Coordinates of C-alpha atoms in Angstrom, one line a residue:
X1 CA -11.5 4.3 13.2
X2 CA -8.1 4.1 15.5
X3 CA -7.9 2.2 18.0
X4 CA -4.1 2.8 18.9
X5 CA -3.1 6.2 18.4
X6 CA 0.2 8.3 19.3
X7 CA 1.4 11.8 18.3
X8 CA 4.1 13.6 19.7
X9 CA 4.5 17.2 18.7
X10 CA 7.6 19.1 19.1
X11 CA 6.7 22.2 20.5
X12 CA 4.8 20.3 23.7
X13 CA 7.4 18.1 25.8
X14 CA 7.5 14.7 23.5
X15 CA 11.2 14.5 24.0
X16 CA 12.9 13.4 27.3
X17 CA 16.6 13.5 28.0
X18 CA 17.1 9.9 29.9
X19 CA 16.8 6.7 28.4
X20 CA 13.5 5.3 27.7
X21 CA 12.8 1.2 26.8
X22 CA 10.9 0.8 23.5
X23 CA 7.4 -1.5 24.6
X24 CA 8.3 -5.0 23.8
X25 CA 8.9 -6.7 20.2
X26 CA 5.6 -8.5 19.0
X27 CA 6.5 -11.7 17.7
X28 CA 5.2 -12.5 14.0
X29 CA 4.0 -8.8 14.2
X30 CA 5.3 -6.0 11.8
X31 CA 5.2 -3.6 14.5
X32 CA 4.5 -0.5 12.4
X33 CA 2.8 0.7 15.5
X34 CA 5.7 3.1 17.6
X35 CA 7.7 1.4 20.1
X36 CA 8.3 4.8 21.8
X37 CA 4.4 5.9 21.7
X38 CA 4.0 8.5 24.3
X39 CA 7.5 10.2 24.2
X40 CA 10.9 9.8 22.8
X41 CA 14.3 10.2 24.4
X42 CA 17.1 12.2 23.0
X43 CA 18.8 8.4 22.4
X44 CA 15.8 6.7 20.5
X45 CA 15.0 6.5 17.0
X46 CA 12.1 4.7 14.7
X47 CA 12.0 4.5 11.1
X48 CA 9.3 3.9 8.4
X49 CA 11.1 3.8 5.2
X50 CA 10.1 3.4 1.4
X51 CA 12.3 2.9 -1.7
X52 CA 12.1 2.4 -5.1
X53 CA 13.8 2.3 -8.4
X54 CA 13.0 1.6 -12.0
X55 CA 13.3 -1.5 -13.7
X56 CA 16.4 -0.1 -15.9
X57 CA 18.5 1.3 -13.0
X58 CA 17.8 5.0 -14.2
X59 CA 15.6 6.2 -12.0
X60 CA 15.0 6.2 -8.0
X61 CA 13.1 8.2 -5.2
X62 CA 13.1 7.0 -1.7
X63 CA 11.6 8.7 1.8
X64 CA 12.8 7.6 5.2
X65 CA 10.3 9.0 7.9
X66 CA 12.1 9.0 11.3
X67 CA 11.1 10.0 14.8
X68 CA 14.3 10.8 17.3
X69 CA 15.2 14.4 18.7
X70 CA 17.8 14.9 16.2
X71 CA 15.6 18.1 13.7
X72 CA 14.3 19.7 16.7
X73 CA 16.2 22.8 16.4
X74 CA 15.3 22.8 12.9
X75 CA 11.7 22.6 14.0
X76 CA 10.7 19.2 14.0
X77 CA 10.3 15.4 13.1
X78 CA 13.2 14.8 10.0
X79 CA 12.2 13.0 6.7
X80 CA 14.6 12.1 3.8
X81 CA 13.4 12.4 0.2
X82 CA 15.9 11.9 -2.5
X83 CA 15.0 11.6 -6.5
X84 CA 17.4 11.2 -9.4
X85 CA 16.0 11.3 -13.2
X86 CA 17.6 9.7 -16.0
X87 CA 19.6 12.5 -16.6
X88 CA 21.6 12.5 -13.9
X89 CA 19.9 15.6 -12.2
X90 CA 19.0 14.7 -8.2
X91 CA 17.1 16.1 -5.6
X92 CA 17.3 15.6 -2.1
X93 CA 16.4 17.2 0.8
X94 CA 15.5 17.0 4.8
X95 CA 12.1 17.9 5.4
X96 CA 11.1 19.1 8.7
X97 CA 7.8 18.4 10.4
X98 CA 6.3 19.8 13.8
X99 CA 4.0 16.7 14.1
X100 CA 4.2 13.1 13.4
X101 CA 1.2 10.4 13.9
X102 CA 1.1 6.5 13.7
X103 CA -2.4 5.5 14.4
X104 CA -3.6 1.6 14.0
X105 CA -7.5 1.2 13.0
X106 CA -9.9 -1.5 13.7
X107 CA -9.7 -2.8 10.6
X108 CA -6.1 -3.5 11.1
X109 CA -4.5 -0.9 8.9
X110 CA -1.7 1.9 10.1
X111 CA -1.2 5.1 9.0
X112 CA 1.0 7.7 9.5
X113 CA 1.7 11.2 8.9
X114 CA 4.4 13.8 9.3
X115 CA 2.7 17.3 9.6
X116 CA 4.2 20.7 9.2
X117 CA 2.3 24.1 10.7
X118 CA 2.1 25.3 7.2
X119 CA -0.5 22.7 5.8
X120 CA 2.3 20.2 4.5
X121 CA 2.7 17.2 4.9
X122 CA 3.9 13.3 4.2
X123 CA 1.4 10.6 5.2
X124 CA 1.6 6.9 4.6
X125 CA -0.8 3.9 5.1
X126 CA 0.0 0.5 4.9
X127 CA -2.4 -3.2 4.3
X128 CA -3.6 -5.0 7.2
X129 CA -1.4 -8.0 5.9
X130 CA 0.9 -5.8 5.2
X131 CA 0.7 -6.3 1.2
X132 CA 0.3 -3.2 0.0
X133 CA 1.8 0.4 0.9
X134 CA 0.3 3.9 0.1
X135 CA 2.4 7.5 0.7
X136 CA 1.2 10.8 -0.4
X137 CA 3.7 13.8 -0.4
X138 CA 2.3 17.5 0.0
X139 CA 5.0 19.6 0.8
X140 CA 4.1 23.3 -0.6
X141 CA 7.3 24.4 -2.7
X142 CA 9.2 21.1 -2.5
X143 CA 7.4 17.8 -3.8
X144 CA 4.0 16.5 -4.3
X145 CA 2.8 13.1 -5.6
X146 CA 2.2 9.6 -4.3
X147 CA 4.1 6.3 -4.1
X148 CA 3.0 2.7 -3.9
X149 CA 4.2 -0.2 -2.8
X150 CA 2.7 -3.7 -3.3
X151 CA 3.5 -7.5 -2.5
X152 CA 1.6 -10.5 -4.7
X153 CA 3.7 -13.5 -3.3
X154 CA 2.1 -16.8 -2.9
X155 CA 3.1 -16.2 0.3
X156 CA 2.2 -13.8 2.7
X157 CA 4.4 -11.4 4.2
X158 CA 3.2 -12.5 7.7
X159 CA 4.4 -16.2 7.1
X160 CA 7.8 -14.5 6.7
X161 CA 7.9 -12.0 10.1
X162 CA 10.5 -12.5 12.3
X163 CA 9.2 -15.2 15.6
X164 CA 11.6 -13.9 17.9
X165 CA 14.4 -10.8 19.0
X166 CA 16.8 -12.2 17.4
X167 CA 15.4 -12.5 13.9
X168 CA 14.3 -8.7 14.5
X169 CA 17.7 -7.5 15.7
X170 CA 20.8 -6.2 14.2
X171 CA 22.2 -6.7 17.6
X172 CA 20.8 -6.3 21.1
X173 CA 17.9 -3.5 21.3
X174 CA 18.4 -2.4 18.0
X175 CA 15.4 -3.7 15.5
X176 CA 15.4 -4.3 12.0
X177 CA 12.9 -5.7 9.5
X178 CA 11.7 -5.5 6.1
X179 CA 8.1 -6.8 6.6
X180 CA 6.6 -6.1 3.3
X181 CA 9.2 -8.5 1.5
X182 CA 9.2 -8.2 -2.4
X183 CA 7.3 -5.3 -3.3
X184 CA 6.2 -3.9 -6.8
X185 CA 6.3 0.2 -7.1
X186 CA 5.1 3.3 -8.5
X187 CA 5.7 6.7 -8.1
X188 CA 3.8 9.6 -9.4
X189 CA 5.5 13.3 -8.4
X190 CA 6.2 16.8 -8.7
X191 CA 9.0 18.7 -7.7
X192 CA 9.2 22.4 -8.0
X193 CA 12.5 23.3 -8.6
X194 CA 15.3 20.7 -9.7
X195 CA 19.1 21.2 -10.7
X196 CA 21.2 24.0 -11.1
X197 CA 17.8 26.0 -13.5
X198 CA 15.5 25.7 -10.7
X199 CA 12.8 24.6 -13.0
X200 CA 9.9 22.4 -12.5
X201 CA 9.8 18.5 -13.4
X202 CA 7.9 15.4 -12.4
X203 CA 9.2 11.9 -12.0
X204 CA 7.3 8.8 -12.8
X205 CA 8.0 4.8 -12.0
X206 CA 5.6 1.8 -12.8
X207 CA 6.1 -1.4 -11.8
X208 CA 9.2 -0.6 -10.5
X209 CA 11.6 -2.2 -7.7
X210 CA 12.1 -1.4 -4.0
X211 CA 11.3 -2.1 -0.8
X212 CA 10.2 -1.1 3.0
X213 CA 12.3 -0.7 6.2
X214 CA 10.7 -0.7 9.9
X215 CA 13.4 -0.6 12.1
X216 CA 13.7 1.3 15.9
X217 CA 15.5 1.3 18.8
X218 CA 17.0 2.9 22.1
X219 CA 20.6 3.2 21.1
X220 CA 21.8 5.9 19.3
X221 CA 23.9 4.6 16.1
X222 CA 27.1 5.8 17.1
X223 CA 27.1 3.6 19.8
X224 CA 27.2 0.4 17.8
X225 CA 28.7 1.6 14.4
X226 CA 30.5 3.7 12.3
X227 CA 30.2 2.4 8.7
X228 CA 26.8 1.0 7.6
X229 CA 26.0 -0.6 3.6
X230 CA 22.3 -1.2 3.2
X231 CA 20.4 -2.4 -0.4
X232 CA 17.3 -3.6 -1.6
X233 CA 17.3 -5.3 -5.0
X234 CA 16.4 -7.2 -7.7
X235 CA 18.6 -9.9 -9.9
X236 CA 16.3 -11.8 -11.6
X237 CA 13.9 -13.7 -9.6
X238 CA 16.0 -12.8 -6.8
X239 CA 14.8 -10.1 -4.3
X240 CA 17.4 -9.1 -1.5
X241 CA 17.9 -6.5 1.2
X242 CA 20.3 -6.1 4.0
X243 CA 21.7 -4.0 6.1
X244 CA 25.5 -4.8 7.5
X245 CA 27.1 -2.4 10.3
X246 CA 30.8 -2.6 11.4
X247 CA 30.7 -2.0 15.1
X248 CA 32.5 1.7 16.4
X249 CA 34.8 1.5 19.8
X250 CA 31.5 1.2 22.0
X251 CA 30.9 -2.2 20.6
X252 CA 34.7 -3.5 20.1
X253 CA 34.3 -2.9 16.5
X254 CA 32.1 -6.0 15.9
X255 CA 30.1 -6.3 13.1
X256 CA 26.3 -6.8 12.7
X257 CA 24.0 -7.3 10.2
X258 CA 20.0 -8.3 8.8
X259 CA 19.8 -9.6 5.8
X260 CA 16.8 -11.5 3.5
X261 CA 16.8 -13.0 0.4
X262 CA 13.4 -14.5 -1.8
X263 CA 13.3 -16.3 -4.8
X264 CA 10.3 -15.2 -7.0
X265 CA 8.5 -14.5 -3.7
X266 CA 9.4 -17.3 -1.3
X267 CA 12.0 -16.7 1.2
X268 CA 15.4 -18.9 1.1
X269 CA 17.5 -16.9 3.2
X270 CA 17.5 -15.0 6.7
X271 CA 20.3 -13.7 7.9
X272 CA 20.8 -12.1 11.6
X273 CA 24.6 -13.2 11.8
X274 CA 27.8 -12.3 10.0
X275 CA 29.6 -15.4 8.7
X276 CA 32.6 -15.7 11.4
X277 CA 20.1 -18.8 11.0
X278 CA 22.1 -18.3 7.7
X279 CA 24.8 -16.0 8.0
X280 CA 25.9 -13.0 5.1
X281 CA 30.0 -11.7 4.2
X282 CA 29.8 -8.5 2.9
X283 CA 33.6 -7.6 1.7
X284 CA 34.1 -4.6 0.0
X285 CA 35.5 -3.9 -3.5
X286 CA 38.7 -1.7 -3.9
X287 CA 39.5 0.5 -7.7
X288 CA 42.5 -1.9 -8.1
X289 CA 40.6 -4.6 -8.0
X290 CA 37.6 -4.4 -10.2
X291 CA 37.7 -1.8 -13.1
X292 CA 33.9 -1.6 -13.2
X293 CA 31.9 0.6 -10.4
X294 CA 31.8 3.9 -9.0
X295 CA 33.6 5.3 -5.5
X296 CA 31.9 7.9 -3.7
X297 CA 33.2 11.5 -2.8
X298 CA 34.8 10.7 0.7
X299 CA 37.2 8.5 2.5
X300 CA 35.8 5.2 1.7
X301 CA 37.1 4.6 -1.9
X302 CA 35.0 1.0 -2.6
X303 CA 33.7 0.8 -6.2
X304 CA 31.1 -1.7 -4.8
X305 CA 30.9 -5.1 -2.7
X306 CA 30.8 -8.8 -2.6
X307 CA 27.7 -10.2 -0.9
X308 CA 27.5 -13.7 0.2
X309 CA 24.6 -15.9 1.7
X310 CA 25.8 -18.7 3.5
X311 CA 23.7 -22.2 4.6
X312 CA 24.9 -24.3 7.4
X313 CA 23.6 -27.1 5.0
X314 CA 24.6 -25.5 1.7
X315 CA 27.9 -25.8 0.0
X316 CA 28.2 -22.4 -1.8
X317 CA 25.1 -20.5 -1.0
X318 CA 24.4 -17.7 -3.0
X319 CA 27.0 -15.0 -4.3
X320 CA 26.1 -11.3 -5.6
X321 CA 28.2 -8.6 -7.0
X322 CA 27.5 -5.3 -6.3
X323 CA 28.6 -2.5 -8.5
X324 CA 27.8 1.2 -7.9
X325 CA 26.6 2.3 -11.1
X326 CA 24.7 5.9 -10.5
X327 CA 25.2 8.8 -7.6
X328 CA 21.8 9.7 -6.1
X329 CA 23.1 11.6 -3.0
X330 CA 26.4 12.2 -1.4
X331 CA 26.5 14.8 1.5
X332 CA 29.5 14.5 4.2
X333 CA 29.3 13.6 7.7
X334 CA 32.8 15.3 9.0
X335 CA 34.7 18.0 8.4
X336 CA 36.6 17.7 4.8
X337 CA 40.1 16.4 4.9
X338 CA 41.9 13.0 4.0
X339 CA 40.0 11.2 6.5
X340 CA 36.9 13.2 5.8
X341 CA 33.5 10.7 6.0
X342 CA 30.4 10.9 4.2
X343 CA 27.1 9.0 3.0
X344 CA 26.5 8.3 -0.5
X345 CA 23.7 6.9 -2.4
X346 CA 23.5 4.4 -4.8
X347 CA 21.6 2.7 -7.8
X348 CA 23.4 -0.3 -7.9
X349 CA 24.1 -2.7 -10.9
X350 CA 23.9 -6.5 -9.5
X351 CA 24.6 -9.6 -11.0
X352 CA 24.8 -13.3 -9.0
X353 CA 23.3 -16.1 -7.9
X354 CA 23.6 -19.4 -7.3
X355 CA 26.6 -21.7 -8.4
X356 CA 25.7 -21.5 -12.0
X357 CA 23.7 -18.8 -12.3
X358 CA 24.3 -15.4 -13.9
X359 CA 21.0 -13.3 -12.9
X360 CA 21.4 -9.2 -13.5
X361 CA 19.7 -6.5 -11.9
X362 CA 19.5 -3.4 -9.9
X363 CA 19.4 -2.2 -6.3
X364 CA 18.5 0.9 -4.3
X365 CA 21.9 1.4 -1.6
X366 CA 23.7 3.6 0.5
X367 CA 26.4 3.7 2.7
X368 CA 27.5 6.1 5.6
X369 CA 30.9 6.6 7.4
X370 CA 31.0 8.7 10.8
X371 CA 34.1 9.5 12.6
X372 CA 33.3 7.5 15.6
X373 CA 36.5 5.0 16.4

């Protein structure tokens, strides 16, 4: 029953090499519909994306489902699937697909799905109001399974959507939202062959953590960073996702980012603004500093980070401390060397609040380096 439809195919001519402007922002919208419908330039990029993690920090498997031109010589539309069992063992791997279809039906639903010529595929479908999130994975040889996502605030996601650009923006033209808010999860999968034996094993959360990310936009991400941190979490009743970007050369190094933060549902902070209308500080932690937390493999050596939400009417907001307690991914981004960059992914263990409060938790993070300057 669509009644908005759009699917580009890489082998037809989807993919133009000029700049293209995204349709407009929808206010109070979550704009799951694509903001680059009929084509995509080689600059533009949207995301669907959909964590989760285990109530106990020891398990996590997240997809990112992107449109942009940048698998097209590996033969299509990229998606990003990473899994790590209690164990230690992970799995991770880009999945390629020649098609990829966002359609919105009458009844107000969307749906998606990322198709490959052999029969595979990753499809999603997400609530008219937005409370509830469906994916199913079949990918022949690689994963199969389904994950959910589901919000039971009080109050609705759609009370909480950003009213204007600027709540939706990172910075100018480049959107970022989380309209699902605090989201309950499962997974149920399959994976053929994981760690060094090759050997079959599934992977299972219940009423687990997480969250969603819709973001889009014409400008290609070297052109407004070169480091990014993003996390979704739970500490306590708290529930709190970011993302913070420090700016590369092209935009004088400034830094962005969008952040929320709910208490047992409701919403208390949004961020847009880095402290320097809430604002968020996000400083990182250094080895010498802090004898708790992991580094990753490359030049960035933080063993976790500070995060702050400030109130222009509150005198000391809300502090959390981020320690990175378990590797999911790590996979470099430059040639190796002493300045060699990378991305790493996280589970996080997170402890904060308020003044006065002690709350402990878990998050779903990563962080990138490129060698932009």
């Amino acid at each position: 029953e669509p009644t908005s439809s759009s699917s580009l195919d890489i082998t037809s001519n989807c993919i133009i090499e000029t700049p293209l402007q995204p349709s407009d922002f929808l206010p109070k919208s979550a704009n799951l519909f694509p903001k680059f419908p009929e084509r995509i330039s080689v600059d533009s990029w949207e995301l669907w994306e959909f964590d989760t993690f285990d109530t106990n920090g020891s398990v996590a498997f997240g997809c990112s489902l992107y449109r942009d031109a940048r698998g097209v010589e590996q033969g299509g539309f990229h998606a990003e699937v990473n899994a790590l069992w209690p164990d230690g063992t992970h799995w991770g791997e880009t999945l390629y697909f020649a098609v990829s279809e966002v359609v919105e039906n009458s009844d107000g639903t969307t749906g998606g799905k990322w198709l490959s010529k052999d029969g595979g595929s990753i499809t999603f479908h997400i609530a008219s109001d937005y409370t509830a999130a469906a994916l199913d994975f079949n990918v022949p040889g690689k994963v199969s399974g389904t994950m959910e996502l589901r919000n039971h605030a009080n109050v609705s996601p759609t009370s909480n959507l950003p009213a204007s650009d600027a709540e939706a923006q990172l910075c100018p033209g480049v959107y970022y939202t989380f309209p699902m808010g605090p989201v309950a999860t499962s997974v149920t999968a399959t994976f053929s062959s994981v760690g060094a034996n090759g050997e079959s094993r599934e992977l299972f959360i219940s009423s687990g953590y997480g969250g969603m990310v819709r973001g889009w936009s014409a400008r290609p991400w070297p052109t407004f960073m070169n480091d990014a941190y993003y996390v979704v979490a739970q500490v306590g009743p708290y529930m709190l996702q970011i993302l913070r970007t420090l700016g590369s050369v092209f935009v004088q190094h400034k830094p962005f980012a969008v952040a929320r933060l709910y208490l047992d549902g409701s919403l208390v902070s949004a961020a847009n603004t880095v402290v320097g209308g809430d604002a968020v500080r996000l400083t990182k932690v250094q080895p010498d500093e802090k004898s708790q937390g992991l580094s990753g493999k490359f030049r960035d050596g933080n063993v976790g980070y500070v995060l702050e939400f400030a109130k222009k009417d509150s005198e000391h907001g809300w502090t959390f401390q981020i320690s990175h307690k378990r590797a999911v991914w790590s996979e470099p981004t430059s040639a190796p060397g002493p300045d060699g960059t990378g991305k790493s992914g996280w589970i996080e263990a997170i402890s904060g609040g308020a003044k006065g409060e002690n709350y402990e938790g878990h998050g779903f993070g990563g962080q990138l380096q490129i060698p932009v300057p």
